[PDB]
Amino acid sequence: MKFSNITIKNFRNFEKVNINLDNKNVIFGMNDIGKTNFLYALRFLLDKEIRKFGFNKSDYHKHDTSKKIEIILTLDLSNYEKDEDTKKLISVVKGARTSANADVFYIALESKYDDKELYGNIILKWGSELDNLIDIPGRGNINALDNVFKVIYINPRRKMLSYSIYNYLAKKKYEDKIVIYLIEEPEISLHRSMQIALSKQLFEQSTYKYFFLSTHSPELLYEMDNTRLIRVHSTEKVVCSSHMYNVEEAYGSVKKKLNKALSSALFAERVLLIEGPSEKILFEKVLDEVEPEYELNGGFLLEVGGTYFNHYVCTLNDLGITHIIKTDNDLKSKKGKKGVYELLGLNRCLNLLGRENLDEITIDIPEDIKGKKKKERLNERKKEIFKQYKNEVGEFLGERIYLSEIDLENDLYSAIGESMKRIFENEDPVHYLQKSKLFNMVELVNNLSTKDCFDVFEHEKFACLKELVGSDRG
Amino acid sequence: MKFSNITIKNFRNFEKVNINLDNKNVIFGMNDIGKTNFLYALRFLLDKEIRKFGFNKSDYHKHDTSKKIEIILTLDLSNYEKDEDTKKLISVVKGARTSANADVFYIALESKYDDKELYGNIILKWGSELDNLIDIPGRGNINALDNVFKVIYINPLVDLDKLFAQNKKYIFEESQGNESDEGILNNIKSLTDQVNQQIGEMTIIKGFQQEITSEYRSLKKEEVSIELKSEMAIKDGRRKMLSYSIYNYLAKKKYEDKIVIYLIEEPEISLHRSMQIALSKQLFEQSTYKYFFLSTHSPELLYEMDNTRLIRVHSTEKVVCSSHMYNVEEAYGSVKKKLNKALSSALFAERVLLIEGPSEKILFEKVLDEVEPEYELNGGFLLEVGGTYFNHYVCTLNDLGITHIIKTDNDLKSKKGKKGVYELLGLNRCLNLLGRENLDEITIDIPEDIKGKKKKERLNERKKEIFKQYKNEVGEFLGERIYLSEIDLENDLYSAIGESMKRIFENEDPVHYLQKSKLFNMVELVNNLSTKDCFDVFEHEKFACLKELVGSDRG
Amino acid sequence: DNVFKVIYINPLVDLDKLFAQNKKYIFEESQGNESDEGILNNIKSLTDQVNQQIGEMTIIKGFQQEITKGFFSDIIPYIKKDGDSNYYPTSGDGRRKMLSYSIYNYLAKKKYEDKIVIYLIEEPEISLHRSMQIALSKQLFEQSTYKYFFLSTHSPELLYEMDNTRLIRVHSTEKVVCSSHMYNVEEAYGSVKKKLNKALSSALFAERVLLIEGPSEKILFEKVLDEVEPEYELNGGFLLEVGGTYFNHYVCTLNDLGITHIIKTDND
Ligand SMILES: Nc1ncnc2c1ncn2[C@@H]1O[C@H](COP(=O)(O)OP(=O)(O)OP(=O)(O)O)[C@@H](O)[C@H]1O
Ligand SMILES: Nc1ncnc2c1ncn2[C@@H]1O[C@H](COP(=O)(O)OP(=O)(O)OP(=O)(O)O)[C@@H](O)[C@H]1O
Ligand SMILES: Nc1ncnc2c1ncn2[C@@H]1O[C@H](COP(=O)(O)OP(=O)(O)OP(=O)(O)O)[C@@H](O)[C@H]1O
Ligand SMILES: [Mg+2]
Ligand SMILES: [Mg+2]
Structure with a gap:
């Protein structure tokens, strides 16, 4: 019914690895760490043609050859009389299982080196409890596990x-077996529209029930839903982190843009979360002039656009990718009511720690002028909010969340003050930059010389850039 | 020295193509379209190991052996005073140039099938004049192009072994060459050679060397000996x-006297995304790769592209290749990484809609989710341009044969240091697209007591008068797939689904509430849209850019 | 697999x-120390003066500047002629x-002393000289290197030294049938064993064998079969010179294998 867990106790790259699994799961990571030895752990368990050659000396960890290779797969058979595959398992296993535990199954692999004939023999056992596993019965070269599982391996x-052809043979010949697909790098020699078509066929259609997919391209994750993401870390000690990726029912109209933003950010190490494209213009100019290889070393800039930061931070935090948030404090006018404002940037920061949303404040504004002085009255109210809530702001500084006092533009005026007066030639360069954000930021970074980017980068209001580069002072 | 042209006639899937080139060339297109057979036309011309087997019957066009294969390459040699490679070429082809100031050169390949022996013979010819090409001299297995050109073919399917x-x-x-520069190390590289001599005196090898010879000498007592050697190295x-x-190190050491041409076929196979960005920076910024031809399917190898030549193979009626010289200007160089990251995914499409920001991406992605959800599968793409850079994208997509559609707004921008004057922004962008000049600024008399809301309807009435005044230019924009809005996107959306916009937002003015926060209230609008609202957006005559983007003939 | 080791030698061996x-x-193997560990320490010490100074006059150290043990896997055996x-x-x-x-004989005599070694040799005469076939025949049928073998062959020179051997002949009369014979040379034939082996080893590969008594019969019968039926030995005929005395050994060896024996002789 459902794969729950795999435990690779000893193999080529793995010292003690325990990965939570699901149906329809995708494994990714850096080069030269693992993740085809993850697929060889499934070919040595369930595919007969890889299992029949045994283990060599090089299949042991660091050529130590005095330890035991053990690969244990846990299956969840909780749903009875709803799926045919559970009856396909139980009609072959017979009674190795017990009616006290009628929900979990363990298929295990053990291997000890002979060290006289120089051959590692693979002994397979199955059972309902992890202690007292009995051997799988077989007559000749045929095991009892070969009547259950059919494994189809795709490599271009x-x-x-x-x-x-493999899909036609799977839907014509293999109705009585559980078919497990292992697709290893399908994006090679394939156009990206065909990669998006294969992603739609993999994650929407029901002809791929159980697949393990290894990939390097973000276009195969454009249509992902109800999957399990396994990330193998870049360290020399192999750590794997898994996340059950689901998209909620409230995010149904956002889901294409959400997946197309997140699927490129999954292949990084440090992700900076920003709001709009003018932040990307300014931060790409400053990171071009200060640290020009940041995409090479694992940095990424991610656009959110106001979807409450929860989905990205839960997905990146479950996989072990460092998330840095740069944001601004803004008040949002309510719907159909006059003079009330929701503290939207503070609430969007406060839902990441896990709190309640704050109560809305109100201020009385007369009919007067509303061209200029309403913005300084709202800026004084934002300064009073940022002076009021200092312990929660220090709790956000305990995380990597960086909330501005008013906006990005007031922090940019606090970083460089004379340069924005020289470029824009105005009494206030903040208000001219607030008129057209996508045009005047281009005019600012076209006239921005060197060492102004160093004054932006070394400032205390822009420590998120130093977190995204990753240079440590102490 | 510069590459200038190639001309391929009767080659497998190619019938007649004529493609301009450069030193750095990037080849892209669909699956099974001719990217491999374009790279083999430079292998049959310049590499001897592919040329020495000849042509089969299957190398001809539609398996027709009566027609002849001709592959002609053009070189520009006007940099003789500055390039060492031009002097590498001229010192072999000395007698065949036709004047003292001829900067063109032609390297040609002809072929003609023989039916009795079933063989395709390859005859190579060169000259400064295309009518008077002579045969390349040679003796034995070596002709005279082999002394000048070295072709390194890079494929990730081969291993390091x-x-x-x-x-x-x-x-x-290495130990013999470089005018004995490793001759300082050569007496003590024999010390490393004799490290491999006393590996022969462990007793597990010395027992084998005696016992194999004692087992061998029980047959006839032959005068033999059995020896063992490994000769390995580490990196x-x-x-x-x-x-x-390894290829860059061998190109730096061996081939200083030769012109090195790289043929890098699909270098994104089993590489990471950051390694693709690092390979793109090495290929387009460092001077190690002077000449390459590259085929790719990945947009991350074009994140650093500059001074390059983009070739796009496509199939409208025949297998036809479009070609564009990609340069970024010096005024655009402060935003060049954002330009290449936006444009490198849009190069692999068929119809590209150029929108302004992310709110248009939210609304158009939910409307295209509801109406035609496989638009990305067929060749549709949505490109965020920032409203500022319309010439660069339209020139790059138009020279490559990709259909560009622009949906834009009619904006007015305030000047600096002068009160009351305004600059036409969207009309100047859409008229700089057509080649016309920019327009003069216009002043609007707005008194100081009229502020806040009513200034926006006075600017909207001035935008209506400006859109009424230039009606023939708007019809010229509609002739060229340019879609200028009358005021904004939101007024066209109020023209489309404005009863539902009054129902959802609950106010009497839903245009102003969505423009109070353009990125927060757009999601609040589009989460509550039904199926009939999205079809009313798609079938509207103010949103014909979506009907041009999906490619159907419904409108 | 704990009792039987099977070594199969095909005709298309590749040494590599x-x-x-x-x-x-x-x-x-580890084998402790082998009294040469300081020689292996001199292997380790002379690798510590090569990894820090490989730059010549700073041409490949500067090329690496701009971007910033168990080596028995590829050992190849060779055959060296002396001189x-x-x-x-x-x-x-x-x-x-x-x-x-x-290499198969060394691996049988060293690694598989605890087991029973069975050789399955398909056609060992291929790309060998005649004297190498006679030397392989002597080593197969005399020495104790090949205690259990099953041999298939097409050459009579590998049967020049045969004794204590089961000979199996595969042939076709109505179906595929194999006829077997146990071959021993007796004590009375022990002085003339090589001549009977060199005579009989070519007559084992025939269908009809005529047993004649000398060379004048071979001259006259080869003239008559040269003028009448000149493709008689293409079709399985053979003329066997007995030597006058040995009629029992040839007839029982050829009759147990299904080969038709024909005798023409005199009254002496
Ligand atoms: N028995 C072993 N003991 C220790 N390390 C081993 C062992 N076997 C393999 N390795 C290491 O694991 C690596 C295997 O890399 P692998 O092919 O799993 O990486 P990958 O992430 O799939 O690669 P890529 O992204 O390039 O396709 C070897 O290069 C080696 O460093
Ligand atoms: N002799 C020939 N006559 C006509 N067409 C031919 C001939 N030889 C090859 N072709 C065509 O050329 C195609 C070769 O595709 P090719 O490998 O050049 O494309 P590609 O763009 O590199 O593909 P991919 O992206 O899958 O690697 C064949 O599929 C066929 O359609
Ligand atoms: N370049 C060379 N210089 C000197 N001797 C060489 C050279 N190349 C090969 N030999 C020798 O020539 C012989 C090559 O054996 P070759 O295959 O020519 O002989 P052969 O009589 O056909 O053998 P076989 O009976 O095994 O078929 C070996 O003795 C080898 O050492
Ligand atoms: Mg791999
Ligand atoms: Mg190809």
């Missing part, structure tokens, strides 16, 4: 015909 | 990144 | 492949077969 248009 | 077996004798080429993504430095 | 596949048995010091990779198929036979 002729390749779309190679997909369709 | 097959290049490393050639590197076992290239270490001996799917780190093997490939090792082999890239 | 066999050596590589078996290199897990040899050269992969020459060069190592040619190209070698013929006569000695490349016999080095693979020596």
